[PDB]
C-alpha cells in the first residue's frame, strides 16, 4: 500500500 501510488492512479482515471 502506497498512498502516493494509489493517488496517482486516480490521475489516470480522471
CA dihedral 10, 1, 4, 11 (to 10 degrees): -10
Which helix (H) or strand (E) segment holds residue 13: the answer is helix 3-13
CA dist 3 and 1 (Å) reads: 7
Buried b or exposed e, range 1-14, using 16+ CB within 10 angstroms: eeeeeeeeeeeeee
Residue 13 cell numbers, joined: 482515471
Q: For residue 1, what is the DSSP state? A: -
Q: For residue 14, what is the DSSP state? A: -
Amino acid at each position: 500500500i502506497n498512498l502516493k501510488k494509489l493517488a496517482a492512479r486516480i490521475k489516470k482515471k480522471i
